[PDB]
Design a protein around this ligand. Sequence first.
Ligand SMILES: Nc1ncnc2c1ncn2[C@@H]1O[C@H](COP(=O)(O)OP(=O)(O)OP(=O)(O)O)[C@@H](O)[C@H]1O
Length: 283
Amino acid sequence: MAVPPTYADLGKSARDVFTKGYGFGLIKLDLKTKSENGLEFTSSGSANTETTKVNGSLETKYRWTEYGLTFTEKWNTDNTLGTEITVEDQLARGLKLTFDSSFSPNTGKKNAKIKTGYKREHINLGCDVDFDIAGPSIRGALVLGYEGWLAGYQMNFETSKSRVTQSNFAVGYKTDEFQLHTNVNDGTEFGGSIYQKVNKKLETAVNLAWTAGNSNTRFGIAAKYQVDPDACFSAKVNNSSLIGLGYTQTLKPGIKLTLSALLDGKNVNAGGHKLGLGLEFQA
Ligand SMILES: Nc1ncnc2c1ncn2[C@@H]1O[C@H](COP(=O)(O)OP(=O)(O)OP(=O)(O)O)[C@@H](O)[C@H]1O
């Protein structure tokens, strides 16, 4: 509550209005299980309707909530294999330590990561260390909270160049009904968003972005409407004349079907329009 989100999560709700409920140019297939404790899995299939390629992924996850411990295994179709062990609230409440290891037989590449987070009232801290063979990189982030206000800083240091390759600032304001987010990346990319939960059935979002040195501006508007408890409608536009439409229907308890269409406003009157289909299977 008084505990602020991580840097990456600043502006999440707004991003979510634009991203969720849409799966353009894909046939997506998701099998998920749920347990508060022990085993759960997430299985995913994806066909790209342009490239005809078919991707798959499995993720198994074991939670030992007795000791704030979680074990996760990942497997992709391109034989990428991943292991993730996380410890949360063990040494100190709000402390989180994650060891991650990855391997690709197809490219011989191995990768390992260590992520540490510490959060408490008004503060959310993070330090991620990537032990890439090109050289270690270190990402640090800090989010300060004051009476609904949020200020964040985020950086990335690459030891091989021994140079900062990323320096981002964010400032925002967050209640449960309304969220303001602004950020500037590398003193170069400016972003801003407003999120509003207008009522219990309607959420809206506006997003702005522009780039120093260019007079252009990108914006988008988006909404999500909960028509009943088993149907949800999403619509979005941007100033490149793109229109996104999405409908999500519960066919049966545990089963949701999403249809999505991306229209190019320049030529809605006949043209190439991306469709999407999503099927989520729960438990
Ligand atoms: N419709 C949804 N789509 C994606 N994630 C969901 C959805 N509903 C609930 N979740 C939550 O997200 C988790 C799944 O992983 P996921 O990658 O989707 O998280 P995220 O996208 O990073 O952000 P978020 O947790 O808000 O969805 C689940 O544990 C669940 O708590």
